[PDB]
Amino acid sequence: TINPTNYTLLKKQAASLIEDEHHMIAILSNMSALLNDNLDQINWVGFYLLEQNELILGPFQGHPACVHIPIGKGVCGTAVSERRTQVVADVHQFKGHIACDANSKSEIVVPIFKDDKIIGVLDIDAPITDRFDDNDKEHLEAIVKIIEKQLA
Amino acid sequence: TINPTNYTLLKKQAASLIEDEHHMIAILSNMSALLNDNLDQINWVGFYLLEQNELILGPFQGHPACVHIPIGKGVCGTAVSERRTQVVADVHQFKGHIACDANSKSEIVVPIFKDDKIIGVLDIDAPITDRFDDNDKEHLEAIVKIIEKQLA
């Protein structure tokens, strides 16, 4: 069972942990908390930032994670190489998954852009398969857009 | 009731989420998770970094928090101005506590140094009073020393 999220109100809340703020790490840290507090059936939510051509672990809510993820590898790395959101129903069956993806049963990764350049990703993992659907995708991408506008 | 923490083994674990790593934010993010996973009776654990003469929110495990904390104000700000660890049994009775400290009943804040300069603090809040004692202080300061050596 997955309790629904009121994404409509969540987007307004997100605007508050983003508005008037210009310290990116602080924005990402608070956003990881906001999402964790409002998404049921997830075991990890956070960000990875693109640096020196590889994803580097950023703020998150959950257990310790891998720090380095190569572009094109893993669910997160594939989101960057594909330059599009990845909605994975079964990570174990995801072509390109890596050991670092081990504790994720299903997952959604949204690329974050700035000046047409991917600067990182929003990554949300779940302890069960098929956690995310098209609706979750639409609302989470909208929330990422709010983050992008603030970082722009 | 507060379940004890095996700080001896925790220090060795900390060395693993710090060793060979040079990305500070990644180190701090993973450390917040490690501490959260091994400390009972706490409701927030994370870091604030000193920037432009004020504390700025960094990686943490818990609910959204205030982004800006002035030096000398609040439990965290007082740790920086006093240049020493603050072990607070009752935040509500702490001289200088601020609205941003509202959800913390007891707390411990350890300053983090680099080249004799305070670069931030480790902040751990609890939902009950008198959560931390001298023993917690000794072990947490030792863990901060491990972080300092890696960032040095």
Side-chain angles (χ1 to χ4, degrees), chain A residues 21 30 37 60-63 65, chain B residues 30 37 60-63 65 68:
Chain A
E21 303 295 341
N30 269 338
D37 292 346
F60 69 86
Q61 298 301 308
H63 294 122
Chain B
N30 269 338
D37 292 346
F60 69 86
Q61 298 301 308
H63 294 122
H68 308 75

Side-chain angles (χ1 to χ4, degrees), chain B residues 1-5 35-42 126 131-132:
Chain B
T1 303
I2 302 169
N3 294 308
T5 56
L35 286 297
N36 190 48
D37 292 346
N38 291 283
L39 289 173
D40 181 45
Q41 211 65 288
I42 63 165
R131 168 69 183 74
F132 308 97

Side-chain angles (χ1 to χ4, degrees), chain B residues 80-116:
Chain B
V80 55
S81 66
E82 289 291 304
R83 297 186 75 78
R84 67 181 299 184
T85 299
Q86 301 292 299
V87 182
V88 186
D90 186 353
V91 175
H92 187 62
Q93 306 300 62
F94 180 89
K95 182 65 63 59
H97 70 75
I98 53 177
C100 289
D101 298 313
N103 192 55
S104 308
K105 299 302 182 183
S106 59
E107 172 179 3
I108 184 169
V109 183
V110 181
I112 305 175
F113 297 76
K114 180 171 182 179
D115 299 302
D116 302 301

Side-chain angles (χ1 to χ4, degrees), chain A residues 77-89:
Chain A
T78 301
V80 55
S81 66
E82 289 291 304
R83 297 186 75 78
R84 67 181 299 184
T85 299
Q86 301 292 299
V87 182
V88 186

